[PDB]
Design a protein around this ligand. Structure first.
Ligand SMILES: C/C=C\C=C\[C@@H]1O[C@](O)([C@H](CC)C(=O)NC/C=C\C=C(/C)[C@@H](OC)[C@@H](C)[C@@H]2O[C@H](/C=C/C=C/C=C(\C)C(=O)c3c(O)cc[nH]c3=O)[C@H](O)[C@@H]2O)[C@H](O)[C@H](O)C1(C)C
Ligand SMILES: Nc1nc2c(ncn2[C@@H]2O[C@H](COP(=O)(O)OP(=O)(O)O)[C@@H](O)[C@H]2O)c(=O)[nH]1
Ligand SMILES: [Mg+2]
Ligand SMILES: [Mg+2]
Ligand SMILES: [Mg+2]
Ligand SMILES: [Mg+2]
Ligand SMILES: [Mg+2]
Ligand SMILES: [Mg+2]
Ligand SMILES: [Mg+2]
Ligand SMILES: [Mg+2]
Ligand SMILES: [Mg+2]
Lengths: 371, 205, 146
RNA sequence: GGGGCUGAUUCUGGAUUCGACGGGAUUUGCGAAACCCAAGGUGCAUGCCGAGGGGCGGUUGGCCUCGUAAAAAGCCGCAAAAAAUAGUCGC
RNA sequence: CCGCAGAAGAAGCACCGGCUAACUCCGUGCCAGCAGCCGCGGUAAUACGGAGGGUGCAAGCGUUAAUCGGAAUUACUGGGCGUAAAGCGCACGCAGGCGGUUUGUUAAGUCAGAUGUGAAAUCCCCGGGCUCAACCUGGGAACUGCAUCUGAUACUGGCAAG
RNA sequence: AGCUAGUAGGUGGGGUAACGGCUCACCUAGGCGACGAUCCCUAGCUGGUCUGAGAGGAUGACCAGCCACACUGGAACUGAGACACGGUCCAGACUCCUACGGGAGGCAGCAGUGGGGAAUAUUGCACAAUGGGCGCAAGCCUGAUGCAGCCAUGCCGCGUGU
């Protein structure tokens, strides 16, 4: 809160969701150190590339942390698959790539650690070919993707070769990730993802601005679980730096006045007044396929109670279908009505995720609202 | 917050010569007006006490357009002053500017006079006012500004003014839309359709 | 024993049998412990062999903090075919009204110990009715006051 | 945001829950919907139309209708000279 | 303040059996339920839930929290003690309270006159300005109190005589 | 229901800007208390405010006067004026920093944050006016103050139309 941030080199979000205990934290720390040297839980570090300013999100690679990882990847603009070159693909890596494809991460860069732990020039190529084949078979891009090999912990050790290699890694990261599209057309909207309580400052809510801008001193409305209320913003900041306005697409922390830590939970949205209204039941078309798209095999019936993940959080919901469909067997391209317990401010065209038993069943697009 | 809504039902709730709408469209006892005959028409439960006093207060308030709190303030001022509390209260009610306009004729109805006073169709001593609660003093003059001259609003009101009788204290010329208010009325000139000491008893309760 | 003190002090029970009832998971798992509110269960004629009526669900803290579990939910009595039409006829022309009395357990089923009680007559209100008539007459006779 | 933990009864290694819910083996005491032919007579008959027609005003070649030659007629009704509720109960 | 299109951009709450201003229907059937009290609700609820319609206030309506009033229900103005609560079980007696009749003298209690004072602010009265009001402000009275100087001697009292 | 012996007084010294057991040495053994001494609980007081016709009862919201306080406690200095509200020293708790040699802190000021609660404010603008202190004076600053924001928290007025 002592640095006046300059809105140059537009913000781009990059997230590392690589394999567990394969060097994600070490890799991001090494990247930050080498960039700050040559240029002068979800860990949100930042670094200013000469091309663009990036915010690096090291997400937890644990399966049980998938719920917050969903927002971390939806938050994310470019994925970094961090994997060891001595073990190759893993079930955890496959789950992570499936989640990334289901959340819609366009650009992914593969990094191969433990390059020097292997005294050969064929095993590294074999594992690179294997991961490339995995990407090409799991609906991912192919030979037009920069694949990065090298050591993630020696990048911090005194060297020159690996420093140059990681600098080249950062270069094509910023090359392969062009200027992203921002949605500052509609009024301001920001889904909440974390809450902090600053002693002497107050409560601050973190998140990626979905749309619109936030000027210092603007009135906004909290809409979400069990509550729709009003508030005032004072002191827009980003990564402990002074800001003047907050564009859309970057993870920022907005300071709210008259906010209670227990009263405000994750799942709500800070919108412009009179824009969106929370609803508990709405009509949506489902896009489940027969068997090979996450959906189950046996022809289940009504009363299904899945979690409907949204931009922020999820909630257990019920589904009702119009007459003409005796069963709700997988293969549901039809429209139905979904009722949720916790009301969340929603708009037409919203894309949500249907999940159950730790696996995604199908997608859904909001068609109408029944309040 | 001036009262707004039905008026014939409001009048027939009590049943009196409170006052009527300025326009007339078959104003008579056609079939059911205030004492509805035929198969029903229970008009008065005949309440023992304090009920007639409440009805008198309500009819007084709805005639003059004043609210309960302001009416009670006027009653307190009248009790604080000398003379009789009821006549002092009636004097304040008539000194309210809207009733002055209505009795001068520029207001077709009392609600219309309040509307004009709010819309600045009235001026006092060569000064605009947009308060229907202003109290006029004796020996004063109240004029109508040039903008309100061209109102079919006022033309109809002045036409209807001369069908009634005229008061002891107002002298108005329509060649200039100006009226002199000389003295304050008394119970003798005021209509004897209500009792004042019952109202005095009620709020002294 | 859930003796239903109301049905004990008034219109002693005369006939009963043993049967369970149908219920969902919300209004269950507390009758196993014993907490319930079955005082003067108003069981009336239902087409489904006189579905259980009157008695509500226990106020134990099994609530989803919205309702207890079910402010009004269907409860079914159990009888193959012995008392639908006979119960209707008895209520119509005998004076015997079947009510639920206790909740005994086979250690698994919360049994509806419904008892066929006699309809007892109301207390003689022939004094309070006249008191009310005199009160309304007094309220009406206040006319001659001005 | 995550870890542990409670979601009955001796983690029930079985309840017809005697009665609730789609309906069912078994025999039938049943006829077309539990289960087919037309075994007594009965052709004016199995079996098909582009299609054309009332008492005041319209019509869904028809919910009326023909053995289909082009005719014997149903459904809406008060607007005119009609039976308009002879205009508003001059009904 | 002057112009601008159009009523065009702006009403809710409580109650409706007596206290208290307001009546009908439907359904449940000592059940669900309202309530300050009286008290309702056991098939026909103007009282419960809903609906219709009326009444009371109105950008404010109801519940709750605290003081006084009605409570003469701590009563000095302004209660009572035989049977509702209340005459000690009885007697003696100190401090204490009150005290028969007349005279003189003291001015203590008491009464009168005068002075200073009772901060300002606030209540009140006569006026004034904010579109009147709310609000502010000028003057006046009041703040019943307090102390001091001089008189009154009927009463209570100090002192002296009966 | 008894308290007190620096306690009651006197004789002299010291001390205080001045009286005085304020203190010292001696002597006298009193002083206070049933009109409540001593001790326990509670409490800022007053002008006033509310409720009352009145005497009365409740209370000290806004504002003004006075008192006391500045994390708890003790002590002193400067200064005319303090045992000092954004001076000093020290004992205790807490918090923070440290290079671990050692240092800083007291929002019951303006705001603001954590906790409590049935529940109550913006980390604004300005010396523009008055006042405050400093200075030949222009001029400095003032979270006093004035204005601005939110809240129907209370009073008043107007409007939703004729
Ligand atoms: C995943 C949960 C959270 C997502 C959040 C939301 O997802 C979304 O609502 C999203 C809507 C598109 C959503 O609902 N996703 C969540 C839910 C739905 C899932 C989406 C997308 C899919 O389509 C049906 C998606 C995989 C789809 O398959 C295509 C190809 C298939 C790939 C193979 C893998 C799959 C399945 C598979 O079963 C499979 C296999 O076949 C062989 C071997 N092994 C496998 O395991 C293509 O790759 C498309 O991408 C939006 O992206 C929102 O922006 C969001 C981020 C808020
Ligand atoms: N030998 C070797 N070890 C590596 C390399 N990259 C990462 N590691 C190891 O990965 C560990 C860091 O794991 P970490 O990032 O904290 O786990 P994660 O966050 O779940 O991915 C370190 O202890 C390294 O030893 C590499 O290139 N070579
Ligand atoms: Mg009194
Ligand atoms: Mg009293
Ligand atoms: Mg008495
Ligand atoms: Mg007695
Ligand atoms: Mg005796
Ligand atoms: Mg005794
Ligand atoms: Mg001395
Ligand atoms: Mg205290
Ligand atoms: Mg301070």
């Amino acid at each position: 809160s002592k640095e006046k941030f300059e809105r140059t080199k537009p913000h781009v979000n990059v997230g590392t969701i690589g394999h567990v205990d394969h060097g994600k934290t070490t890799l991001t720390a090494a990247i930050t150190t080498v960039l700050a040297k040559t240029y002068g839980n979800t860990s949100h570090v930042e670094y200013d590339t000469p091309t663009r300013h990036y915010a690096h999100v090291d997400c937890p690679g644990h399966a049980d942390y998938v719920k917050n990882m969903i927002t971390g990847a939806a938050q994310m603009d470019g994925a970094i698959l961090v994997v060891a070159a001595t073990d190759g693909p893993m079930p955890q890596t496959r789950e992570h790539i499936l989640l990334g494809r289901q959340v819609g991460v366009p650009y992914i860069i593969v990094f191969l650690n433990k390059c020097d732990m292997v005294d050969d020039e064929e095993l590294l190529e074999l594992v690179e070919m294997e991961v490339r084949e995995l990407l090409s078979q799991y609906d991912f891009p192919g030979d037009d993707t920069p694949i990065v090999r090298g050591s993630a912990l020696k990048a911090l050790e005194g060297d020159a070769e690996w420093e140059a290699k990681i600098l080249e890694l950062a270069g094509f990261l910023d090359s392969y990730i062009p200027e992203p599209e921002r949605a500052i057309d509609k009024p301001f909207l920001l889904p909440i993802e974390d809450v902090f309580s600053i002693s002497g400052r107050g409560t601050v809510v973190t998140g990626r601005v979905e749309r619109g801008i936030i000027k210092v001193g603007e009135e906004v409305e909290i809409v979400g679980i069990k509550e729709t209320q009003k508030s005032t913003c004072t002191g827009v900041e980003m990564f402990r730096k002074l800001l003047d306005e907050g564009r859309a697409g970057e993870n920022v922390g907005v300071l709210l006045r008259g906010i209670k830590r227990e009263e405000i939970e994750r799942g709500q949205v800070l919108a412009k007044p009179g824009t969106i209204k929370p609803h508990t039941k709405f009509e949506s078309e489902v896009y489940i396929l027969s068997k090979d798209e996450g959906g189950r095999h046996t022809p289940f019936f009504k009363g299904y109670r899945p979690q409907f993940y949204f931009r922020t959080t999820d909630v257990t919901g019920t589904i009702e279908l119009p007459e003409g469909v005796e069963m709700v067997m997988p293969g549901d391209n039809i429209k139905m009505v979904v009722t949720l317990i916790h009301p969340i401010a929603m708009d037409d065209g919203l894309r949500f995720a249907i999940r159950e038993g730790g696996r995604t069943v199908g997608a859904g697009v909001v068609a109408k609202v029944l309040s | 917050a001036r009262y707004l809504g039905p008026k014939l039902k409001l009048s027939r709730r009590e049943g009196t010569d409170l006052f009527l709408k300025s326009g007339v469209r078959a104003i008579d006892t056609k079939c059911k007006i205030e004492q509805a005959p035929g198969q029903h028409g229970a008009r008065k439960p005949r309440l023992s006490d304090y009920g007639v006093q409440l009805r008198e207060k309500q009819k007084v308030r709805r005639i003059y357009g004043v609210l309960e709190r302001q009416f009670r303030n006027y009653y307190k001022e009248a009790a604080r002053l000398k003379g009789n509390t009821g006549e002092n209260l009636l004097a304040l009610l008539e000194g309210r500017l809207d009733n002055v306009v209505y009795r001068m004729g520029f207001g077709a109805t009392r609600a219309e006079a309040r509307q004009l006073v709010s819309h600045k169709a009235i001026m006092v001593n060569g000064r605009v006012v947009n308060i229907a609660s202003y109290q006029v003093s004796p020996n004063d003059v109240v004029s109508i500004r040039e903008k309100a001259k061209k109102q079919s609003r006022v033309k109809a009101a002045l036409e209807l003014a001369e069908q009634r009788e005229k008061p002891t204290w107002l002298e108005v010329d329509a060649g200039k839309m100006e009226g002199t208010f000389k003295r304050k009325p008394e119970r003798s000139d005021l209509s004897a359709d209500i009792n004042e000491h019952l109202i005095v008893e009620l709020y002294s309760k | 024993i859930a003796l239903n003190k109301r049905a004990r002090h008034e219109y002693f029970i005369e006939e009963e049998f043993e049967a369970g009832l149908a219920l969902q998971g919300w209004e269950v798992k507390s009758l196993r412990a014993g907490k319930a509110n079955i005082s003067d269960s108003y069981v009336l004629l239902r087409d489904g062999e006189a579905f259980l009526f009157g008695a509500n669900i226990t106020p134990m803290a099994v609530a989803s903090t919205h309702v207890v579990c079910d402010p009004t939910r269907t409860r079914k009595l159990l009888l193959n075919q012995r008392e639908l039409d006979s119960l209707y006829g008895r209520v119509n022309r005998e004076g015997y009204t079947v009510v639920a009395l206790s909740l005994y357990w086979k250690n698994a089923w919360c049994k509806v110990k419904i008892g066929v009680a006699k309809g007892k007559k109301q207390h003689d209100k022939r004094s309070d009715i006249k008191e009310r008539e005199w009160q309304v007459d007094k309220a009406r006779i206040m006319k001659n006051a001005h």
